[PDB]
Amino acid sequence: QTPLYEKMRDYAHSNKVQELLQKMTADLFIERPADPVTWMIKWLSEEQKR
Amino acid sequence: QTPLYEKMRDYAHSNKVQELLQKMTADLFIERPADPVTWMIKWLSEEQKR
Amino acid sequence: DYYEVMGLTRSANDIDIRRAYRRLALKYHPDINKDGAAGDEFLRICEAYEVLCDPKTKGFYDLY
Amino acid sequence: RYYTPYEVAMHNTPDDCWVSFLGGVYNLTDLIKANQGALAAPLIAAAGQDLTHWFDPTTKDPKRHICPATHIERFYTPMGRFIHVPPPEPMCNWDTSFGLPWWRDAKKYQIGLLSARTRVIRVRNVLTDQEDQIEVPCEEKLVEIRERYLELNAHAKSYTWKALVRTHVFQELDLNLTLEENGVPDETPVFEDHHVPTDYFIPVLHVYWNDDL
Amino acid sequence: CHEQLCINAMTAVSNVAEAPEARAILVASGAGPKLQHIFETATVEVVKRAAAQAIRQCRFKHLPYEVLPG
Amino acid sequence: EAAERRKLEEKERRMQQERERVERERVVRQKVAASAFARGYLSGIVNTVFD
């Protein structure tokens, strides 16, 4: 129904999450690691400083 | 459609990374943290333990 | 999507869309349905039927 | 058995992918597991979705058309090239050794059968008053309605069912006859055609206890 | 006749007929008409009550319990 | 008294099953919708990041 979707659409189409996810995916595709989960852990760790 | 683009599409559409992304985004739109950078770190840390 | 809001599937006919909009827009109209989570629902019902009741717009949406 | 559309929707992931098309529910998980590339994208993106619009009724293969660019007849794949679809031009990697297309290999990739319609049954436990709406396929024997209701009461086998069969008196229901044979009709089409809300009246199934030990 | 024996048997039948299958055996062995006659023709109140309870206990298949005979 | 005890026991167990079912129902209802939206939004994200 509209209420459950709207609560998630409003969250996900807000700038912080969306342009965090897009840059993360871009760098993930560029790097091409064997195991993505620890690479995302690293990337988020050295991105938390920024 | 250079060999890089095709290789990226093969990696992007692979099982591992795509299911991991789908899982992470579903969980993140459930919890809805006001600081996804850290929630992603804790979520990935607990996932990697398995 | 424009389809799931009506409840129909991607292969719905024209009479199927007529019936779906009929029931969904007689269940959520402001003068009938007093209040609830029926603000966005009626607007998306109207938008979905307006998009899907005209073959040119319907097809252009279906391809994209 | 059978599946409501929502039940098919529960499985949408490369780990458990279910698709409903032409009345059949298919578990394509081993396909996506064995074919992991850009070929698997257009049906991963429609995991748990209804895939009947891809195909045509007369033949079980997907729709075909005269390709505008090459003027050679081939499958209409606006979504993209799904598994088991040949490339438009002569390649050197698309083998045809495999046996049958997945939309034709029913024995190996079909489980259950999609319900053409669903209805709402209001089950009422008469001993301990607990109303419950539920959706079940409109063509199913009471044994599997009881199986659906087993998630509401783990002891529903001992209970006895009853319905307001026709004046109207609460009478027993045979298990092997569907809800329509047993005298519980479906009137939602008439409800809609007469501008009566489909949640105004719901048929009711009373569930009494049968003492055991 | 043999009144205490009759009421003891009646109580035993009432106890056993609570089991699911037992009912079908008791109605098969003719406990129905026997208990009906015992209830109908007797005047001792305690045995009459045992008879009414036994009859109601032998013909029930649902949790709502019908009113005791008589 | 034995009959009454059994009836009350079953009443209580059904009442408890109701609450447990409600909790699990809420969890699964949210999970499935989260998965569907994740599907759609991630398809969009991958298309845009590729472009």
Swiss-Prot record, chain E:
Q: What is this protein called?
A: Radial spoke protein 14
Q: Where in the cell is it found?
A: Cytoplasm; Cytoplasm, Cytoskeleton; Cytoplasm, Cytoskeleton, Flagellum axoneme
Q: Which family does it belong to?
A: Belongs to the flagellar radial spoke RSP14 family.
Q: Where do the ARM repeat units fall?
A: 20-60
Q: Which residues of the full protein are shown?
A: 311 to 380 of 387
Organism per entry: Chlamydomonas reinhardtii (Chlamydomonas smithii)
